[PDB]
Every structure is written in C-alpha cells, then in structure tokens.
Amino acid sequence: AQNPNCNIMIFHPTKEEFNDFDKYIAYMESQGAHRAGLAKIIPPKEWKARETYDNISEILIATPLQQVASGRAGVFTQYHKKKKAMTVGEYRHLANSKKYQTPPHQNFEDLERKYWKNRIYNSPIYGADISGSLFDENTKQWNLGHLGTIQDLLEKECGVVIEGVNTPYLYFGMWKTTFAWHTEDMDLYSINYLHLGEPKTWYVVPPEHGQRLERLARELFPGSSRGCGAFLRHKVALISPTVLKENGIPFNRITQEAGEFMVTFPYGYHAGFNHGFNCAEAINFATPRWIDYGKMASQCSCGEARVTFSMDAFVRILQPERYDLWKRGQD
Numbered sequence: 001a002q003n004p005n006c007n008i009m010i011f012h013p014t015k016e017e018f019n020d021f022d023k024y025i026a027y028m029e030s031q032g033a034h035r036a037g038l039a040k041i042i043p044p045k046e047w048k049a050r051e052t053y054d055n056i057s058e059i060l061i062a063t064p065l066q067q068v069a070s071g072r073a074g075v076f077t078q079y080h081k082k083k084k085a086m087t088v089g090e091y092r093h094l095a096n097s098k099k100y101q102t103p104p105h106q107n108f109e110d111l112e113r114k115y116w117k118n119r120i121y122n123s124p125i126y127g128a129d130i131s132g133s134l135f136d137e138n139t140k141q142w143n144l145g146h147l148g149t150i151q152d153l154l155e156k157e158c159g160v161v162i163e164g165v166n167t168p169y170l171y172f173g174m175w176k177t178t179f180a181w182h183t184e185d186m187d188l189y190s191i192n193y194l195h196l197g198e199p200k201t202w203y204v205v206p207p208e209h210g211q212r213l214e215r216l217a218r219e220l221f222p223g224s225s226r227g228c229g230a231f232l233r234h235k236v237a238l239i240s241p242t243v244l245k246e247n248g249i250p251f252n253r254i255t256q257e258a259g260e261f262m263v264t265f266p267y268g269y270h271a272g273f274n275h276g277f278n279c280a281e282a283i284n285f286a287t288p289r290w291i292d293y294g295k296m297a298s299q300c301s302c303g304e305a306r307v308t309f310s311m312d313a314f315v316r317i318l319q320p321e322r323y324d325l326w327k328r329g330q331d
C-alpha cells in the first residue's frame, strides 16, 4: 500500500502534467495521496491564475459573517452572526485594522500557538461562500470554473442524467477566521486555490480514521450529538491539535501559501484558520472513486445543515432510502 502512515503529500507537476486534471488526480491517488485526506499541489512555475489582482476591490461580500466562539480554548463551537454588506476593499481595510490584524510573531509555530490560545476571545469576520471565480477565462489549466461537473461524473458512471450545476465560491479571510471540522457535502472532494494574501493552516484526519474523530466529537459536544446524528455537518465544532493528541486521534497539519492548491479527499475531515487577509477559491468535484463514499455519506436530518439545490439529486439517486426523511430536513 502506498503512503501507509497517511502523510500529507506535496506534488510539483510539470506544465505537461498540468494539462489533464482528472489524470493528475488519478496519479496522486496511485501514490497514496488520498490516504492523508489532503494533498498540496504546487503549480508549474509557468502557470498563472490571472494577470493581476489589482481590480478586485469592488467585489461585494453581501453577508459577512462574524465568527463568535463559545466553550474552552481547545474545544469550542462558533456561530455566524450576519453583518452588513461591504466591498472587498472595505473588508481588506478592516482586516488590516489594529483590532483585527495579525499579531507580531516568530514563525508559523508561534502564530499557531497564539491562534489556539486566543481564538475564543475574539470574533473575526469572514467573507464566505460568495458565488464567483477569480480565474482568468484564458487560464486553461486547473481553472476551477471550468472543471467537469459532478452531475456529468454521475452520468458517465451511473448512466442517469440529473439536474443541478456546480460552481466555485470565493472566501475572503482575515486573522483568526476559522473553518470548523467537517467533510464535504456528500463526502465529495474539494479543491481550493489560495489566490492572494496570507496563508491558511489546515488540519486533517485520514479518511480511514474519520470515525474516531466522530466518536471524540460525540463525547466533546454531547448535546449537539443528541440533537443530530451528523452534527459535524453543521460546521460549527472546533477541536485543537492538543486535544486531538491527548485523545489519540490521528491527524496531520500543513500550511497553504498564496499560489498553491489544496485537494481534500472523500471523507477527509478537515479544519483550519487564516493567518491574515486572504482570498481563496474553492469547488467540490467527483471522480469514479467518490461514488461509493457518496452512497455511504452521513446526512443531517435535524434541519440545521441546510444544503444546496444540487445536493438533492445526489441524495435522490445515491441514497433513495434516506431521500424521504432528508428532504423533510430540507423543507
């Protein structure tokens, strides 16, 4: 078996290798990349997502989210308080203010220590889930707006045509902005490009050990767990690396910088935080290997997780038994 310790692998494709997305994903998995739940992809030195980022300030963040924490330093939930719309220009100015800016620090390690020590005493503001793309339409390789769709993958694999479309989202982050422990909708893959600014640190549990994370989570968030059999889909729960180590949960960590891609793999639980002002673009995708994970994916039926129009059809085809009760959580 390739990558038996489930380490995060880093790839350096040539411009020749960078022409065929599907085939490069298949290559990475032949080297065991998926076992980690997360891989880093450094694009060829010749490749650019777009010419410059000089004209992005007028993008609107219609619903900025203030991330308010409750709990203890290493075990907390966050809720999202809706704030008034601002442009990316205004947001960037906010992220750089004395109140929200990244603090003085030695290295990613000193910064990580400060994040986990101090996160809960602050409420950073995230621009999340904004429909759009910053890839130049002339960028032909690894353009997240031009990937093959999940609906076409399902159709090629299973012979059934379904409704739905699949488009990218932009995330604008600042210091301490946080992504809670989760897998993707329907345990899909994701791909994430950090377009500009400060880094993003990621924690990930190998897919083969995901259930151990879930079991710890049921113990750490006992009331959430009683309310919903898949409460991690609410994307509110945080657990520090110290707490994970204390409980024997296998995981890994890696820091993404501007200009790099990350791929998350089916059923790879991940979480993280932003080091300062940045902009990332992400989208879900599928391969033939995803189909079985889609069929087994846990669902939120308490009605908190509330998920896309396109997800309906996945549940309808892949999980016809769940499909009655699930859309009751959606309606």
Ligand SMILES: O=C(O)CNC(=O)C(=O)O
Pocket (backbone or CB within 6 Å): 171, 178, 179, 190, 191, 192, 264, 280, 282, 283
């Ligand atoms: O970048 C973020 O804040 C969240 N993105 C993801 O969880 C992802 O790409 O899978």
Ligand SMILES: [Mg+2]
Pocket (backbone or CB within 6 Å): 055, 056, 057, 058, 059
């Ligand atoms: Mg603009």
Ligand code: NI
Pocket (backbone or CB within 6 Å): 182, 183, 184, 190, 264, 270
């Ligand atoms: Ni994700």
Ligand SMILES: [Zn+2]
Pocket (backbone or CB within 6 Å): 227, 228, 229, 230, 231, 234, 300, 301, 302, 303, 304, 305
């Ligand atoms: Zn739920």
